Amino acid sequence: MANRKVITTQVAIMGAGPAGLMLSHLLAKAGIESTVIEIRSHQEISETVRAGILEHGSVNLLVDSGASDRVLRDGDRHDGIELRFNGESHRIDFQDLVGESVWLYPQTDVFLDLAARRQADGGDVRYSVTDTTIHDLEGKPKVWFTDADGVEYELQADFIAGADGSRSHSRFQIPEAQRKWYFHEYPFAWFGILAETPRSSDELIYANSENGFALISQRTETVQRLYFQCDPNEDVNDWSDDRIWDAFRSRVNGNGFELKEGPVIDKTVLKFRSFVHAPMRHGNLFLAGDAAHTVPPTGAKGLNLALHDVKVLFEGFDSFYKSGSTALLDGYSGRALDRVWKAQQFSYWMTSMLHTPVGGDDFARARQLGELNSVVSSRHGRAYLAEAYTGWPA
Amino acid sequence: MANRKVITTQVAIMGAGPAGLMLSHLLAKAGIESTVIEIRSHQEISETVRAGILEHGSVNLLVDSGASDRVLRDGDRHDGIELRFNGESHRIDFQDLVGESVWLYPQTDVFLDLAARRQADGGDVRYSVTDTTIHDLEGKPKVWFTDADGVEYELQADFIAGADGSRSHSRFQIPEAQRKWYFHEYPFAWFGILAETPRSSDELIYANSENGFALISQRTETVQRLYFQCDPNEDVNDWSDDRIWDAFRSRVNGNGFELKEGPVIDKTVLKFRSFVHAPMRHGNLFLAGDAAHTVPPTGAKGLNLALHDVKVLFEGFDSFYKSGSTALLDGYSGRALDRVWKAQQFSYWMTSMLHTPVGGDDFARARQLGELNSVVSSRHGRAYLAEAYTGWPA
Amino acid sequence: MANRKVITTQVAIMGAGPAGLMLSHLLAKAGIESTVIEIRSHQEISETVRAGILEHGSVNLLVDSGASDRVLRDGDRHDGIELRFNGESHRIDFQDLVGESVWLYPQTDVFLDLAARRQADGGDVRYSVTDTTIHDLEGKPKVWFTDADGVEYELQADFIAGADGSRSHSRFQIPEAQRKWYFHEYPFAWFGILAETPRSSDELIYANSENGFALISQRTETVQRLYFQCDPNEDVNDWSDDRIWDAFRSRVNGNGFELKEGPVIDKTVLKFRSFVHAPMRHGNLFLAGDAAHTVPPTGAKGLNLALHDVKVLFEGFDSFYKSGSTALLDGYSGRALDRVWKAQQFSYWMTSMLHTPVGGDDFARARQLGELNSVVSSRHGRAYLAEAYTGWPA
Amino acid sequence: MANRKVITTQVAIMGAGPAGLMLSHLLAKAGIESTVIEIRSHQEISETVRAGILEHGSVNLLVDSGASDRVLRDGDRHDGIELRFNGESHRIDFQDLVGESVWLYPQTDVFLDLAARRQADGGDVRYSVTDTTIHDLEGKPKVWFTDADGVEYELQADFIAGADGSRSHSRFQIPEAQRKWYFHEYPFAWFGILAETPRSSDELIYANSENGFALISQRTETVQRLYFQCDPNEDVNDWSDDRIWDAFRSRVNGNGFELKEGPVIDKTVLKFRSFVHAPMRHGNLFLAGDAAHTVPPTGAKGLNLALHDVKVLFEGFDSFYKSGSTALLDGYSGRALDRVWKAQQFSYWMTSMLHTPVGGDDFARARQLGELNSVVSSRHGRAYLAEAYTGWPA
Ligand SMILES: Cc1cc2nc3c(=O)[nH]c(=O)nc-3n(C[C@H](O)[C@H](O)[C@H](O)COP(=O)(O)OP(=O)(O)OC[C@H]3O[C@@H](n4cnc5c(N)ncnc54)[C@H](O)[C@@H]3O)c2cc1C
Ligand SMILES: Cc1cc2nc3c(=O)[nH]c(=O)nc-3n(C[C@H](O)[C@H](O)[C@H](O)COP(=O)(O)OP(=O)(O)OC[C@H]3O[C@@H](n4cnc5c(N)ncnc54)[C@H](O)[C@@H]3O)c2cc1C
C-alpha cells in the first residue's frame, strides 16, 4: 500500500503503439523478456483513427512474424496511385514499373491486431500507466511507473526502447549536448475528414490545383478518408459539410471526373513537420518510430519508418542476446537514420510537388507544374516515384 | 533631320550570338533575307570563352543545316558524367540509361563557326552598331541603329527576332502590362578558371561537399575548365592560384582520386539567376535564347534552349513565308516555353542537389545527402537524370 | 592553423556606409562596444560620387547625435520641388503643404562626417579588410576577417549587424528557408552625369516627357547633378557629351525654359530595382540599409531608409544593453519593415508616375498623364506627395 | 424603294439612356429641338439594373435642371465609405475631408425620372425603333429609322449626338484613320448579386482580402447589391447560394464583423475594361457617354462621366445656337476627354489598390498593402481619395 515494487525484464519498451507492440512481439518470439508501458487506454488508442498505407516490407513484417495475417484478409492491395493536376489524372503503375504494391489497411487495425496478438500470447503490456520517469540511462536502466490499478513499480531492464511517439517522454530525457535535432516546418496542414460514401476512385488520388492540394483516399467501403490542404490554425467547428465538399470539388472535380460525396462523420485538422533526432541510441535507450523522427504525411512513410526501425533494432537485440555481439546494436542508429533520411527526402519531395505553395510564388508555381509534368511524362520518373512509394525493394 | 538610310529585310535579327547567327543561317538556307545587327565586335565576342555541352539535337541542327560540322571534328562526344560526394564518384552512363550521348564543344567555337559561315555566304551581319532602338512592334517593325562607320540607318522588317541574350535590349521594349517576368535568384555564384593541365578524369565530374560544389570540366587537352561554388560578390583578384587550388582540393580530392593542377590562366566570377519572360512573342517581335530566359549553368540547358528556340522560330517563319500560314508563328511561344520550363525545372534540380546550402541549414544539408543517395543509388533515378541531361530524347 | 588573433566586442558591424558608421557612433555615444569592418579603402569610398536628399529627421539625427553639424552649413535646405510635364512646370511646396523641408547634401559628405567623427573619437573602423566570413549566427556570433595588413582575426560579438550594402555578404548567409526575397525590376535605368554649370532652377526638377524622364538636381555650386531615363544596359562609351545634352534638351527644355549646360565631367549608368529581404533579423544577425532592401531613386528614400533602420536598431540594442530587455530588438524587423514598405510603395509610385512607359502603351501614357494632372491639380494630392517626400511628418 | 417620311429637329440624339435623355431635356429647357431614337422598349430600358453612385455634380445637374428632384427624397446620401483590409475597416469621411457627399440612388430610377420628365414636358423619345442608318455626318446630318409601328423616317438636323452605350453604333461608323482607340483589359470581373436583406453596414464597404475583392453595396433598404472578384468566365449556374455567401464571408467577415445574409434573388457576372475613343467630335457628330469610353466599375464613374459629357456638350450647343460661337462646340472633345482620362486613372488606381492580383505576385501584394496603409493613415491621402470619389469639386 506504499511499496514501489521491483519487477524485472530484459527490454523495457515504452509505448503500446505499433512500433512498441511490434518490437514487443518480435522480442517475445525470439524469447526475450519485454515489458511495455503505455499511458493511454487500449480504447483511446483504438478510437484514434489514422489511415494507413503499408509498403510491401511492412506487410511482410506483420505476416512472416505471425503478428497478424488479418492485414492480408481485410486490407486492400493497390498496384498504383494517381496524380491529378491541370485537370488530368495520371497513373503511376507500381506493378508495371517496379513490381511492388502497397496495402491500404488502417493503422488502428494494425494496432488492434498487434495488441490482441500480445494479449492472446500473454505478453506484458500495461495500459494507462502514470508518473512515468526514466533513470540510469548508461547503466542498467530503470523505469518508474504507476500502473493502472495505482500500484507503483520500478522496472529494471538491460535496455529501454522508447517508442513514445512524437510527444516522446523518453527522448526528452536525453541531454541536449549529446543529441542533435533536425527540423523543418511547413506553412500548411491537412484538413482530414472521414465521410460516408462509395469509392470516388479505386486508388489513391493525389491532386494539385490552384486552390491547394487534396488526397482522395479510402478507409472502409462505408467510410472514405479524405484530406485537403489548409491553414495550420483552422477550427473544424467553423466548417460546414457543404464548405468541406466545396473545397474538395474546387480541387478535384472537373474534366470528366466527379467526386462522390457523403455525410461528414469526423473532421480534424492535422499539422506536420520534418523532425529527426540523431543519433537514435543514447546509452541503453534506443528511440524508434515517431519518438525519434517525423515526416510530412504526403509520402505515407511514417508508420513504415517506425516498423522498419523496430525491425532493425530487434535484429540488433537478437544478435546480442544470442551471441553477446554489440556490433548490431551499435549499428542500429546508422542503419535506421540512413532510411530515415531517404524517407525524409522522399516525403519532402512529394510534399513540395503536390501542395500548392501557400501565397502564390509564381516562379515557384511554374516550376512545380514543370516538375509534375516531367514526372508523369517520363517512365523513369514514374518508376523512381513508385520505387520510393512502395518501399525501395532493392 | 539628316538622312538615316532606310533599308528593308524580311527578318531583322538583334544579336550575333549563337542563336542570332543560327537563325540567320537557317533563314538563309530557306531563302529568306535576314539582316543581323550586333553591338560588340567579332573579336569581343570571340574573346568571351564559355564552355558548352551540346545535346544531340543541337549537334544535328548545327550539321544538317550546313552551319558547321567542325563540331564533330573538334568536339568530343561524352557518354556519361560523374556525381562525386562523400569521396565516392558515381557515374551516370547516358548511353546505358537513356541511349543518348552529348558533345562537348566550346560555345565560342560554335559562335566562330556560325559567324564565319555567315561571312562566307555573304549574310548581312553588322557588328559594333549603336543607338539601337526598336519601334512599331505591332506594325511593320523598325530597327534604328548607327553602324560601325557612323552611318545612321532605319531597317524595316516584317518581324524582329530578339536574340540579345540576358543583357537583352529587346525585352525591355515590350510593354510591362502585356508580359510577365519570372524570377528566382540564388545565394551563390560560380568561380570559373582555366588552368593548363591534362584532364583529371575522363568525363565531367560534379562534386558536392561540405565546403561547396565544384565542377571539373574540359576545354582543351592543354586547358581545363573548372568551376567552384562561391559567394555572389567574390572578387577574383583577392585569390591566388594557391587559394583557388585549395578550394578545389577541399571539395574534390580524396579516396584515391587526385586533382591534377596547372598554371591558373584565367579566373572569373560568373553570376546566374533563373528568369523567364512570358509570352515569348509580342506583336511582331519574337524573343529567343537569353533574351527570353536564363538558367543556372548546372543543368547545361542554356545554349540548348537557345538553339531549340531558334529552331522552332525558323519553322514558324518558313511556314509563313512559304504558305502564308501563321499557325507555326502563333504557336512559337507555347512550344518554346513548354521546353523552357522543362529546362527550368531540371537546371533548378541539379543546382539544388549539388550546391551546398549556405548557412549551415542542417535539415537542408541532411536531406541533400539523402536525395543524392537516392538518385545515384537508383537506376531509375540515374535514368531520369540522364534523360533530362541529354535533352529529353525518346 | 596559425592562431587568428581573437578579439571581442558587443556589436560587430559589417559595412562602413553611412548606416554602419552612424550605428557605430550611436553605439559609441551610449557607450557600447562596436567594431566596424570594411572591404573598401576610405579613399575608394570618398571617390564614390552620390548626391543625397535628406528628410528633416535625418538631418536631426545627424546633428543631435553629434555626428556632424556640417550638414547645416554646407548643405542647402529646399522647401519644395517642381514636376515638369506637358512643357509646364508645377511646383510642390513642401513647406506650404505639410510644413516640412528637405536638405540637399551629398551623401559622400555624410560618409566623410561619420568616418571623420569615428576616427576623431575612438575609432573602431577597419578599412580594406578581406576574407570576410560569418558564423554561429543563432548563437553567440563570430566574424572572421583578414585586415588590411594581413592580420587574421576571429572577432566574437553578442550581435552582428549587416550594413554591407546591396552587395551584401550577410544576406547571402541566412538560410533560404528562413527568409523571403521580394523583387520588382524596371525596364529602365538612370544615366547620371556631373557637369560644370550654374544652377538651372531653384529646386530639383522631376521632368516627364514623351522622350523620357529626366531629373535636374544640384550637388555643388560649380557642378550640377543630372539624370535621364535610359535602357538598363546603356554604355557611356557609345556616348558623346553633345548627344547627352541633346537627350536632356528633348526631355526638359521648352515653353520658355532652357537648361544651362556645361562640360560633361562625369558620366555613369545607374541600375536599380525594388528589393526587400524579410525578416530583417535572423538570430543575432541584424540586417540594415541596402543590405536588407533597395528602392528606385525617384523618391529619394534610400539613405533615409538606411538611417531609419540604424536608429530603430540602435534603440533596440540600447534598451537591451541597459535593462536586459529584448522587446525592442524583437520588434526591430517589424518597425523597419513597416517603414520600408511605405518607402517602397512611395518610390514605386514616383517611378511609375514619372518615367515614360517603354514600348508605346498608348493607354499607359494616357493614364500616366491623367494621373500627373490629377496629382498637381488637387491640393490634397500635392500634400500627399509632399508628405511622403519629406519623410511623413506627423 | 419606299419613301421614308421626312422629319426635322436641330439635335439628333441617339439613345434614350441617361445621357441622351439628359441632353434632350437640357436642350428642351434651353429651347433647342431634340429628337431621340432608341432601340429598346421602354420596359427594356427600365429593366436594366445598374446600381448607381452619383457624385456631387450629378446630383446638382439632376436637381437644378428640373429633371427630377425625386433623387433627394428617394436616394440616400452617403457621406463616406469604409475600406476593409487586413480585417480592419478604416473610414473615408467624405464630408470631413472635402465637404461633398455622394448619393446612392439606382440608375434605373434615374432613367425612370428622366423618361417621365421628357414625356410630360413634350418630348421625342421613340422606343423600340429599328433599321438604324446615319448619313452625311460632316455636312448637315441625316438619320434613317423605323419606329415600333413600322413608320419609316429620315430625320434631318444640324448635329447628331450618339448616346448608344458601349455597344455604340455611331463610333463604329467613324473612319479608323480619323480616330484613335485606347484599350486596356483586366484579368477579372465582378460577381454581382441582388439579395434581400437589411443593411450590414451604413456606408459602402470595399474590402480587399487574400481570397479576393468584395464590395458591400445597397440599392434599397430591402434589397442589397453585392460584388466579389472572380474569373471573367464563371457561371452563376454552377453556384449555390450557400457557396456564394461563403465567398463573401471569406472576403469580408472577421474581427467581430459578420455579414447579414438572405437568399440570393439575382446573380450576374460583369466583365470590364478601359476604353477611350478620341477625339470625341468627328465632323458634326458628337459622342458622349459609354459610346465614347468605358471604365472599370471600381469608381462608379461611368454614368457620372456620361452626365459630365452631356453637360459640356449642351453648353457648347448653347454657346453656338445662342451667339453662333463655335468655341464651345469645337473644344468640347478636349474638355470631355480631359475629365475622362482623370476618371480612367481614378478607376484604375482604385482597382489596383483593392483587387487581389490574380495568381500571387508577391511583391505586388506587399506593395498593395503598403499603398492601402499609406493612404488610410494619411489625411491627405484619404482626402484625395474622397475628392476623386465625390466628383472633383471645383
Ligand atoms: C500512409 C501513411 C499516412 C500517414 N499519415 C499521417 C498523417 O496524416 N498525420 C500524422 O501525424 N502521421 C501520419 N503518418 C504517420 C503515422 O501516423 C505514425 O506512424 C503514427 O503516429 C504511429 O506512430 P508509430 O508507431 O509509427 O511510431 P511510434 O514512435 O511507435 O508511435 C506510436 C504512437 O503511440 C503513441 N505512444 C506510444 N507510446 C506512448 C507513450 N508512452 N505515451 C504516450 N503516447 C505514446 C504516440 O503518440 C505515437 O503517435 C502516416 C503514415 C503512413 C504510413
Ligand atoms: C559557366 C557557364 C557554363 C555554361 N555551360 C553550359 C553548358 O554546359 N551547356 C549549354 O548549353 N550552355 C551552357 N552555358 C550557356 C548559358 O546557359 C547561356 O544561357 C547560353 O550561352 C545562352 O546565351 P547566348 O550566348 O546564347 O546568348 P544569345 O541568346 O545566344 O546572344 C548573345 C549575343 O547578343 C548580343 N547582343 C547583346 N545586346 C545586343 C543588342 N542590343 N543588339 C545586338 N546584339 C546584342 C551580344 O553581344 C551576344 O553576342 C554556360 C554558361 C556559363 C556562364
Ligand SMILES: Cc1cc2nc3c(=O)[nH]c(=O)nc-3n(C[C@H](O)[C@H](O)[C@H](O)COP(=O)(O)OP(=O)(O)OC[C@H]3O[C@@H](n4cnc5c(N)ncnc54)[C@H](O)[C@@H]3O)c2cc1C
Ligand atoms: C535622396 C536619396 C538618393 C539616393 N540615391 C542613390 C543612388 O543614386 N544610388 C544608390 O546606390 N543609392 C542611393 N541612395 C541610397 C543609398 O545609397 C543607400 O540607402 C545606402 O548605401 C544605405 O546605407 P548602407 O550603409 O547600407 O550603404 P553602403 O554605402 O552600401 O555601405 C555598405 C558598405 O559595406 C561595405 N561592404 C560590402 N561588403 C562587405 C563585407 N562583406 N564586409 C565588410 N564590408 C562590406 C561596402 O564597401 C560599403 O562601403 C539614395 C538615398 C536617398 C535618400
